[PDB]
Ligand SMILES: N#Cc1cccc([C@@H](N)CC(=O)NS(=O)(=O)OC[C@H]2O[C@@H](n3cnc4c(N)ncnc43)[C@H](O)[C@@H]2O)c1
């Protein structure tokens with residue numbers, strides 16, 4: 031009686047589990063005793079959860095909150111939801127109870143599912159509740175009864191909604207199109223093991239899952255508890271034989287500061303990928319110098335398209351380089367830089383706002399058509415067609431070869447805090463530095479800065495801190511540094 | 515310097531010319547001396563026209579009017595436009611000068627191209643003019659100079675705009691998705707020869723071209739001058755060895771009336787496909803009876819998605835059958851029937867308005883965002899997602915097996931003119947009949963009707979005519995029958 035996605039129709043289930051056929055006994059997951067779960071064993075768990083979910087009578091586009099971090103079970107669940115056309119709303123179990131309630135209030139989901147040993151208690155009787163474990167999907171409270179109206183699942187049905195409360199609605203067509211564009215850029219082979227560090231609620235986690243599983247590679251989820259301590263993190267990457275390490279730039283900060291020599295011992299690491307924010311070039315040069323056999327890729331994009339461009343950093347990074355390139359749009363993606371009148375910028379080195387044409391475009395903001403119409407706008411170079419572009423909120427300029435350079439959020443003398451942080455990171459004893467004019471440093475600095483920086487770039491205040499504070503998703507917490 | 519579509523990005527060029535690689539010497543076209551043009555020779559002409567077009571400096575999404583009927587040269591041109599991301603506006607050379615001017619006024623194209631021996635004179639100096647022939651593309655007036663801004667072609671770039679002045683904007687992604695859905699329904703093999711009868715300006719022509727060329731089959735364009743006379747039309751189908759015959763129901767009307775015995779001699783015809791309007795069941799039963807080895811397929815859909823469903827008619831058609839089924843949506847398509855409150859109709863045999871979820875959805879109506887927002891509407895079963903559906907303007911009901919039945923335009927006792935026309939087509943001496951209560955017949959009838967029809971279905975007037983008048987696209991011209 032449940033609709034199931036057909037194999038020919040774009041859908042995360044068929045896309046991520048194709049390797050269960052061509053390579054059933056190859057590893058889909060490596061976890062830590064180092065264990066592997068094969069593609070066949072993963073499809074078996076997905077099919078079991080999907081048989082259980084199908085009993086609940088949910089209609090296509092009924093929303094399932096998945097509270098978990100990246101685990102074989104949580105990935106088995108989101109793929110079960112995918113086959114049944116039930117958009118998942120991934121929520122980290124670290125999300126505060128209040129923030130979760132606010133998501134439940136707006137998203138009005140039919141079902142909330144967490145791990146057997148999950149800790150969430152606060153869930154209204156309108157929302158069904160279930161727990162999943164290699165034991166199976168276990169319904170605690172059934173979702174409330176309904177009449178199914180959707181006969182067939184399509185490409186534009188929602189795969190997932192990302193909540194930060196702003197909800198980015200992504201279709202199977204959009205996310206599969208992104209995975210296919212990256213498969214074309216041979217970032218990954220089937221023999222790779224991708225260490226993934228992002229919270230499940232961050233699309234960087236969904237990007238890592240699909241890149242691994244869509245390629246026939248193994249995923250190595252790094253638990254936050256392993257990530258937070260430098261020797262522990264390095265022993266986890268060594269033990270699991272990780273070949274690729276994905277994370278926001280901050281994942282390296284403790285290892286660079288405390289354990290650079292053990293970091294150099296990661297001889298199986300072939301590739302590093304970051305996204306989310308600028309990697310401070312002094313830390314990035316330090317990292318590159320320790321792992322000279324690891325390709326480093328600058329990943330640019332936003333939740334609204336999942337991603338835009340993948341750009342290998344120069345080897346070595348020029349000492350004098352001020353900004354890494356964010357390169358060229360993925361195959362099938364296109365950028366217009368438009369000025370403050372909405373006109374194309376053709377001039378080398380002049381910033382405009384990125385307007386992205388992407389096959390991975392979000393459907394809209396959940397229950398916010400006004401916000402949707404401000405962001406997903408009529409193509410300003412062809413406004414009579416009804417074609418839309420993403421008005422990204424990001425500034426960029428091109429260089430002489432047409433490559434892009436990120437130039438900050440349009441809404442956040444032009445100060446480049448990156449140049450302030452660079453000069454400070456070049457001062458004896460400073461391991462980290464964030465500017466917002468206040469500079470915060472992890473450990474005279476003022477005169478060292480003034481020896482090369484213009485007057486408007488010299489910090490008014492330089493504040494010693496034990497660490498750079500991070501958001502749940504691992505980005506610099508500038509709100510937090512503001513408070514103190 | 516011209517952007518060209520990449521092979522990995524949905525685009526009519528790569529989709530229709532893949533057979534130039536796997537089967538270069540197989541026929542792409544059969545024309546009438548019976549000649550063939552191979553896939554390789556077709557790609558050569560496409561590449562030549564595209565090299566010439568690229569010289570003109572047009573930007574991606576610059577519009578090219580193609581005035582032609584279905585010919586190897588006109589198909590070579592629309593595929594050249596496709597590779598360069600130049601949406602084509604196909605216009606039949608039968609279109610009156612006034613109607614063309616009205617299209618030029620709204621669409622403001624950069625270029626108008628016609629055949630060497632084309633007859634159009636009326637084209638403003640703002641629009642470039644060119645003529646194409648196996649000689650090459652020949653520029654008469656260059657388009658006016660411009661700066662190119664688009665770096666890369668994407669999936670959602672416009673393939674073509676259909677004008678009837680209402681302009682349906684179709685993307686490469688939408689039209690390729692439709693061709694792929696039909697390739698999955700093995701309508702056609704590479705050994706087939708598809709006789710196509712629609713004017714190039716009608717998307718039925720574009721449907722036929724892509725089905726043939728995307729499959730590696732041969733296209734057999736039927737010129738209007740061959741189509742208009744019954745023995746001439748049958749000799750053309752015989753000489754070219756057509757294996758499939760596509761056209762609106764009216765293409766059969768003269769052959770059924772004048773040459774039924776020669777029609778039975780079409781021994782190579784394996785398949786017939788119609789769309790656009792109801793096939794009057796008495797003519798359809800007559801046709802099916804003459805070619806018992808031809809599968810007949812009822813094709814339902816609209817320009818806004820190119821198509822929706824393909825449904826093989828029963829063999830034989832039950833004598834008592836009142837309506838052919840329009841079956842089930844193509845793989846990856848989904849229909850909701852919604853009532854006059856906007857609520858799902860689940861009841862067998864109750865009509866509602868078709869809301870279509872389609873991967874082949876139009877981008878919008880050219881320079882008409884108001885009309886777009888009335889037709890491409892928020893999914894009424896999931897309106898907070900920003901997902902849209904086509905509000906089709908078509909009524910339908912389901913039968914016991916969930917199959918659809920077309921029940922007329924929402925805007926056009928409920929009279930079923932089909933039942934009035936049926937009873938008249940069953941009266942001795944009537945070969946055709948159209949009701950609009952007035953009935954028009956091609957050659958006491960009133961009492962024959964009253965012997966089985968309810969009072970409200972009995973024509974007030976029965977008018978003998980020499981023929982049923984047709985639109986350019988070959989549909990019944992009810993406006994025309996109204997005048998007289
Ligand atoms: N390649 C790649 C790739 C792979 C996985 C997931 C993603 C993104 N969804 C990650 C992300 O932070 N998205 S965001 O919407 O929260 O915030 C997006 C914003 O974060 C900033 N950003 C994102 N990438 C950045 C980069 N490489 N350098 C500098 N800033 C970058 C930009 O402002 C951007 O609009 C990209």
Ligand SMILES: N#Cc1cccc([C@@H](N)CC(=O)NS(=O)(=O)OC[C@H]2O[C@@H](n3cnc4c(N)ncnc43)[C@H](O)[C@@H]2O)c1
Nearest residue numbers: 717718721789790791792813814815816817820821823920
């Ligand atoms: N399968 C298939 C297939 C292949 C090629 C091209 C097409 C359509 N684009 C043809 C067409 O007439 N489109 S229309 O937009 O002008 O007018 C559409 C309208 O014409 C009517 N229509 C279209 N198909 C019909 C059918 N099979 N039976 C009855 N009516 C039908 C409906 O009202 C529909 O909304 C369909």
